[PDB]
């Protein structure tokens, strides 16, 4: 029970890249993870009432397996045609600060999850709307790729914990 | 024991060490606990030799703000940069060539690869790093010198909070 929080929760290489240069997540997919442990997906997703993601993140979701989530989803895109029948969603284009009160209203008192990518998260951080960042670092470097949070920003560390092959850490907005 | 080679460095949470203005500003007013988990004091006592790039050696001499009594090797093509105040052996070339000498001078303690990311990557590429230990500061930089600029795979040992920092240690697969 809190005011609705907006949280950016993502996996990353230990050196700060999500997606590699070849546009894939193979470095992520066969790692040990414990979805019911510390910062695990099972406890996290129960707190969440709505998803928001960019166009590439949405395309990745509709093109790999069939990740099923119960919450409504918003996609930041100039391309409505991306919509797949397997993943219905609401398109929004423009300033995320205008979208944010609708996400909070659509979340049913639960939290807003910023799925990615780093450019979408930075938009929310530049509008001052991210309350928490949760990064699960995989035990590899990539050197190059999409950056986890491509800007200058300051946070307060809450804590970190190992979860399988991952280092999971949560930071909070300074007050 | 077996002499290990360890890359131990601070980084922003998003993977940059030196910022775009060539400074370590965002690092210096942060709470850390030297004798805590992965803290500097417990680390340094396991170290018998240091090795670092030219730019790191220059900042250390110019900020003159840090002490050490292990012997130090500096990877530089400008052996002119040496300061009497911070003694060191110059080496240039393939670090795989230098690494037997570091290990023999380590007196059975470990070799600390200080930085930068480029120097760490040359060791990793020659399969010479046994452990990476990164202390992540609670900030992002977006750009700057990369913590480890190459593709590599590791096994996670563990992480722990130390003051403002997330510290984590990964090991070479064996
Ligand atoms: N680790 C994970 O959970 C997963 C990661 N991947 C994702 O693949 C992504 C690719 O990276 P990145 O490029 O950062 O991708 P994003 O998913 O953030 O997509 C960015 C694109 O979204 C559109 N967009 C972003 N902001 C707005 C806006 N305010 N208004 C309208 N359109 C906007 C633009 O596309 P356009 O103009 O063409 O519409 C832009 O190119 C990774 O970042 C990662 O998140 C994939 C699956 C899972
Ligand atoms: N650990 C930390 O958090 C600290 C970091 N620093 C900072 O780090 C920064 C330096 O980082 P970075 O720029 O990555 O540089 P490095 O310290 O790794 O130095 C890179 C330079 O060292 C030389 N070099 C590298 N490899 C070799 C080789 N095998 N043989 C011969 N010469 C070699 C080259 O210089 P050349 O050919 O000219 O000799 C190269 O340009 C400094 O700007 C400093 O501010 C400072 C204090 C603490
Ligand atoms: Na609505």
UniProtKB/TrEMBL annotation, chain A:
GO terms for molecular function: 5-amino-6-(5-phosphoribosylamino)uracil reductase activity; identical protein binding; nucleotide binding. It holds the Pfam family RibD_C. Residues 71-147 form the Bacterial bifunctional deaminase-reductase C-terminal domain. NADPH binds at residues 23, 55-57, 77-79, 94, 117, 123. Keywords: Nucleotide-binding. One of its GO terms (biological process) is riboflavin biosynthetic process. PANTHER family: 2,5-DIAMINO-6-RIBOSYLAMINO-4(3H)-PYRIMIDINONE 5'-PHOSPHATE REDUCTASE, DIHYDROFOLATE REDUCTASE FAMILY PROTEIN (AFU_ORTHOLOGUE AFUA_8G06820). This is Dihydrofolate reductase. It comes from Mycolicibacterium smegmatis (strain ATCC 700084 / mc(2)155).
